[PDB]
Write an enzyme that holds these catalytic residues in place. Structure first.
Site, mmCIF file in Angstrom:
data_model
loop_
_atom_site.group_PDB
_atom_site.id
_atom_site.type_symbol
_atom_site.label_atom_id
_atom_site.label_comp_id
_atom_site.label_asym_id
_atom_site.label_seq_id
_atom_site.Cartn_x
_atom_site.Cartn_y
_atom_site.Cartn_z
ATOM 1 N N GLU A 50 48.423 73.747 78.839
ATOM 2 C CA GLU A 50 48.098 72.335 78.528
ATOM 3 C C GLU A 50 47.032 72.252 77.432
ATOM 4 O O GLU A 50 45.986 72.893 77.554
ATOM 5 C CB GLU A 50 47.595 71.654 79.801
ATOM 6 C CG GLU A 50 47.067 70.222 79.675
ATOM 7 C CD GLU A 50 46.880 69.560 81.035
ATOM 8 O OE1 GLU A 50 47.753 69.740 81.948
ATOM 9 O OE2 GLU A 50 45.868 68.853 81.180
ATOM 10 N N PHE A 51 47.319 71.455 76.403
ATOM 11 C CA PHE A 51 46.434 71.191 75.252
ATOM 12 C C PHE A 51 46.126 69.690 75.153
ATOM 13 O O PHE A 51 46.889 68.848 75.700
ATOM 14 C CB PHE A 51 47.106 71.666 73.954
ATOM 15 C CG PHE A 51 47.398 73.150 73.911
ATOM 16 C CD1 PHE A 51 46.396 74.059 73.626
ATOM 17 C CD2 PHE A 51 48.683 73.637 74.185
ATOM 18 C CE1 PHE A 51 46.649 75.417 73.598
ATOM 19 C CE2 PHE A 51 48.947 75.001 74.123
ATOM 20 C CZ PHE A 51 47.927 75.891 73.839
ATOM 21 N N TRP B 222 47.486 62.679 77.316
ATOM 22 C CA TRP B 222 47.645 61.271 76.873
ATOM 23 C C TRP B 222 46.486 60.433 77.428
ATOM 24 O O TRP B 222 46.293 60.353 78.652
ATOM 25 C CB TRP B 222 49.013 60.706 77.352
ATOM 26 C CG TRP B 222 49.278 59.237 77.166
ATOM 27 C CD1 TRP B 222 48.771 58.220 77.913
ATOM 28 C CD2 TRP B 222 50.161 58.614 76.211
ATOM 29 N NE1 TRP B 222 49.253 56.998 77.485
ATOM 30 C CE2 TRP B 222 50.093 57.208 76.427
ATOM 31 C CE3 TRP B 222 50.972 59.092 75.179
ATOM 32 C CZ2 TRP B 222 50.818 56.307 75.668
ATOM 33 C CZ3 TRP B 222 51.692 58.190 74.431
ATOM 34 C CH2 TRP B 222 51.612 56.813 74.677
ATOM 35 N N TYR C 118 51.635 52.273 90.034
ATOM 36 C CA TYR C 118 51.564 53.653 90.531
ATOM 37 C C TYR C 118 52.428 54.552 89.669
ATOM 38 O O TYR C 118 53.338 54.067 88.998
ATOM 39 C CB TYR C 118 52.080 53.721 91.974
ATOM 40 C CG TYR C 118 51.459 52.714 92.921
ATOM 41 C CD1 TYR C 118 50.124 52.814 93.296
ATOM 42 C CD2 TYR C 118 52.218 51.667 93.454
ATOM 43 C CE1 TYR C 118 49.550 51.885 94.179
ATOM 44 C CE2 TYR C 118 51.657 50.744 94.331
ATOM 45 C CZ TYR C 118 50.323 50.862 94.686
ATOM 46 O OH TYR C 118 49.772 49.944 95.554
ATOM 47 N N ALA C 119 52.178 55.870 89.711
ATOM 48 C CA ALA C 119 53.042 56.829 88.994
ATOM 49 C C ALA C 119 54.529 56.696 89.336
ATOM 50 O O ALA C 119 55.380 56.813 88.444
ATOM 51 C CB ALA C 119 52.571 58.278 89.208
ATOM 52 N N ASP D 17 48.015 61.813 100.354
ATOM 53 C CA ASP D 17 48.690 62.007 99.073
ATOM 54 C C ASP D 17 50.047 62.702 99.178
ATOM 55 O O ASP D 17 50.888 62.502 98.303
ATOM 56 C CB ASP D 17 47.780 62.712 98.075
ATOM 57 C CG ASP D 17 46.617 61.841 97.658
ATOM 58 O OD1 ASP D 17 46.844 60.805 96.969
ATOM 59 O OD2 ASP D 17 45.479 62.200 98.013
ATOM 60 N N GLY E 163 47.420 57.266 85.518
ATOM 61 C CA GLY E 163 46.178 56.947 84.813
ATOM 62 C C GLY E 163 45.208 56.251 85.759
ATOM 63 O O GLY E 163 45.166 56.559 86.941
ATOM 64 N N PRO F 101 44.928 66.418 72.170
ATOM 65 C CA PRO F 101 44.888 66.108 70.717
ATOM 66 C C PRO F 101 43.453 66.091 70.149
ATOM 67 O O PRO F 101 42.629 65.297 70.619
ATOM 68 C CB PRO F 101 45.524 64.701 70.612
ATOM 69 C CG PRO F 101 45.592 64.162 71.997
ATOM 70 C CD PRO F 101 45.339 65.260 72.988
ATOM 71 N N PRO F 102 43.154 66.945 69.152
ATOM 72 C CA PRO F 102 41.820 66.816 68.523
ATOM 73 C C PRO F 102 41.594 65.487 67.797
ATOM 74 O O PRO F 102 42.550 64.820 67.389
ATOM 75 C CB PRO F 102 41.771 68.001 67.550
ATOM 76 C CG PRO F 102 42.730 69.009 68.143
ATOM 77 C CD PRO F 102 43.857 68.149 68.654
#
Ligand SMILES: Cc1cc2nc3c(=O)[nH]c(=O)nc-3n(C[C@H](O)[C@H](O)[C@H](O)COP(=O)(O)OP(=O)(O)OC[C@H]3O[C@@H](n4cnc5c(N)ncnc54)[C@H](O)[C@@H]3O)c2cc1C
Length: 296
Positions: free
Chosen positions: A24-25, A56, A130-131, A166, A115, A27-28
């Site tokens: 996982e990366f 995101w 919700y997701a 959960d 989020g 965005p700079p």
């Protein structure tokens, strides 16, 4: 052979006989930073990741930078890219545009996320809550054209802790069509293993489940990651860092590599190979992960 989809994370997972990683990366914030990250991603393809992901910002705060980086990586690296996507506090048109652009760029995997909690503009009055609302919407709009992942919490989610609570919501997300699951970071192997047992019995015997792992880049950074994620550090791990080790950053990093290797090996063995994929939170750094992979 006839049905295999070479861009699907689910199909790729099941086809592997040998164990593997994912990365996982984020965005700079500058174009120079982005150029440098692409060079780093290119080097890290030598670790043979199954896929790469790009985060995101909640509420669409990084929409253009995330969409641009995910597409560029997919086009140039020759590796499947999974774009993260949060749904609350955002106009439907922004979510539709994001999915359309991913589809046209050849992105075939999305990590569908809530989020932050939903909130409006009080009396001035945001349709996703919700997701699961996003999982259902993606599958309605695109079917299997997107392979959809979701988040899980072995120690329970905490708003800014009950793992059984959960697990109920996780089941709803899987029934709505999620194809794979990635966990919040943890350092207590037993919390993950109890969770994985409950997942198999109550949700799915076969669905791909990736533990999320955070390397130990310094003693202070390790403690900060655990604090922010609400993850517990067991006494057996804390005892590996007595005061004379804590004061020596090179020793902390070396022992930290060993702890991550041990965690991975214990999970693979204790699950009889059911858990064969390991997901790393890179924070856009390469060295610790390259050592964990090469020394294992
Ligand atoms: C692998 C991974 C990647 C991530 N990437 C990002 C990222 O790129 N950007 C970002 O901003 N965040 C990211 N997050 C964090 C995530 O957005 C937060 O943890 C968020 O608070 C919850 O997201 P979720 O998708 O798990 O929510 P959900 O599964 O919707 O659950 C969150 C909470 O909502 C409530 N809830 C859910 N369903 C129901 C229901 N049916 N009925 C009643 N209540 C319900 C529960 O209280 C639950 O604890 C990531 C997390 C993980 C594990």
């Amino acid at each position: 052979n006839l049905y295999f989809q070479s861009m699907s994370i689910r199909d790729l997972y099941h086809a592997r006989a040998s164990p593997f990683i994912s990365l996982e990366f984020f965005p700079p914030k500058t174009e120079l930073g982005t150029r440098n990250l692409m060079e780093r991603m290119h080097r890290m393809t030598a670790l043979d990741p199954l896929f790469i992901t790009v985060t995101w910002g909640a509420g669409g705060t990084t929409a253009e930078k995330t969409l641009t980086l995910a597409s560029l990586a997919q086009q140039t690296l020759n590796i499947p890219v999974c774009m993260h996507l949060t749904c609350t506090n955002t106009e439907k048109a922004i979510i539709d545009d994001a999915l359309d652009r991913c589809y046209n760029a050849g992105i075939r995997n999305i990590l569908a996320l809530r989020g932050d909690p939903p909130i409006g503009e009080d009396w001035l009055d945001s349709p996703f809550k919700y997701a699961v609302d996003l999982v259902r919407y993606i599958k309605q709009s695109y079917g299997d054209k997107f392979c959809v992942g979701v988040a899980a919490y072995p120690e329970g989610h905490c708003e800014g802790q009950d793992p059984l609570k959960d697990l109920v919501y996780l089941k709803e997300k899987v029934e709505a069509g999620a194809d794979f699951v990635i966990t919040q970071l943890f350092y207590d192997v037993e919390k993950f293993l109890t969770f994985e047992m409950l997942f198999r019995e109550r949700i799915s015997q076969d669905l791909p489940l990736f533990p999320g792992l955070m390397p130990i880049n310094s003693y202070l950074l390790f403690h900060r990651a655990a604090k922010l994620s609400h993850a517990s550090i067991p006494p057996a791990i804390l005892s590996r860092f007595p005061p004379e080790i804590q004061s020596d950053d090179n020793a902390v990093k070396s022992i930290g590599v060993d702890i991550l290797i041990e965690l991975i090996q214990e999970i693979y063995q204790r699950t009889s190979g059911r858990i064969k994929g390991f997901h790393f939170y890179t924070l856009n750094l390469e060295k610790a992960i390259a050592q964990i992979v090469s020394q294992s």
